[PDB]
UniProtKB/Swiss-Prot annotation:
The gene is MB. Monomeric. This is Myoglobin. It comes from Physeter macrocephalus. O2 binds at residue 64. Monomeric heme protein which primary function is to store oxygen and facilitate its diffusion within muscle tissues. Reversibly binds oxygen through a pentacoordinated heme iron and enables its timely and efficient release as needed during periods of heightened demand. Depending on the oxidative conditions of tissues and cells, and in addition to its ability to bind oxygen, it also has a nitrite reductase activity whereby it regulates the production of bioactive nitric oxide. Heme b binds at residue 93. Residues 1-147 form the Globin domain. Its main location: cytoplasm.
């Protein structure tokens, strides 16, 4: 469980994200594909993009990134009370996209890297600790939902 203080640190840095959701979304997706190239294989609509600049120029990748962060932001703002928001994401990610929890770990590492890169003064040790805990909670709870659906990834 996160404390109220941890939640507040999460939401404080999240507000910075919300100043430029698109740009954050692009940077996180790009970082994910650079750090863990196998994750790109899971995206039929993006895996033809061959360079960082093609990734940055893709409207579809940018639109997707905004969809992803909007969903994550809505989750985070529930401070752990996120069943209603998490369920549909679990459904799709288990049954259609087939995303293993290890790939969620990779995505979480990309989130932390971008936030630190763009907001180091508002993303020191305690903030990073808090966001890692929020993301860990998300991964824990999605995994349980995955299993309820019969998916063991
Ligand atoms: C914090 C982690 C993540 C969040 C919040 C998230 C969120 C979303 C949302 C909101 C959508 C659109 C609705 C849906 O299909 O459920 C989506 C689609 C998708 N997600 Fe994720 N996602 C996450 C992680 C991942 C990871 C790590 C991968 C792959 C390695 C992945 C692969 C996909 C794919 C392939 C789609 C369909 C994209 C399309 O063609 O339109 N997701 N995701």
């Amino acid at each position: 469980v996160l404390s109220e203080g941890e939640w507040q640190l999460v939401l404080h840095v999240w507000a910075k994200v919300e100043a430029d959701v698109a740009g954050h979304g692009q940077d996180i997706l790009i970082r994910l594909f650079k750090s863990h190239p196998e994750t790109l294989e899971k995206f039929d609509r993006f895996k033809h993009l061959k360079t960082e600049a093609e990734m940055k120029a893709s409207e579809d990748l940018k639109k997707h990134g905004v969809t992803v962060l909007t969903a994550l932001g809505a989750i985070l703002k529930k401070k752990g009370h996120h069943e209603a928001e998490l369920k549909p994401l679990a459904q799709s990610h288990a049954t259609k996209h087939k995303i293993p929890i290890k790939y969620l770990e990779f995505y979480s590492e990309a989130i932390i890297h971008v936030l630190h890169s763009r907001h180091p003064g508002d993303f020191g040790a305690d903030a990073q600790g808090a966001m890692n805990k929020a993301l860990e909670l998300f991964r824990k709870d999605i995994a349980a939902k995955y299993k309820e659906l019969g998916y063991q990834g």
